[PDB]
Amino acid sequence: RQAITRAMADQARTIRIPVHMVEVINKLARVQRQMLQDLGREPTPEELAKELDMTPEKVIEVQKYGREPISLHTPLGEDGDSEFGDLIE
DNA sequence: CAAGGCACATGACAACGGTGTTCAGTGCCGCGTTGCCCGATACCCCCTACCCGTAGTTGACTGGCATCCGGGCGCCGGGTCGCC
Structure with missing residues (x-):
């Protein structure tokens, strides 16, 4: 596992x-x-911050750092031929 | 009637008038050209806070994943095992 x-x-x-x-x-x-799972609703950022014991700015920081890229070579979906890498300047 | 004698003016004669130049000297009064003075600014130091990598954590725990079909269409081209 390690x-x-x-x-x-x-x-x-x-x-x-x-x-x-990580x-x-x-x-x-x-x-x-x-x-x-407990509250059955999206928790507010401050409640999450206190549960993590850190401050909200760290919560937002790690939340933004915990993403993944989206591939350019994906259909735009407006049309099958079009791809995302051909629409951003 | 002609010749000789005196008045006023006249051909030049310099020297003043008044004003414009001259090289000359020295400043007069604005730009500069430079010694300070500071003031800020880059650049060494010390301290600790926090990011990031390494190394443990012992009941047992021994083979996964969901594929994929309604192209469609034809050809190439090779493989592939029956065939006599």
């Missing part, structure tokens, strides 16, 4: 995330999932 999780942290995401940011983001994600 080797597998190290590999997932260090080689899964297109934009590399440090291992301890555990921070997965911790906040799983606990937020628990918040949704």
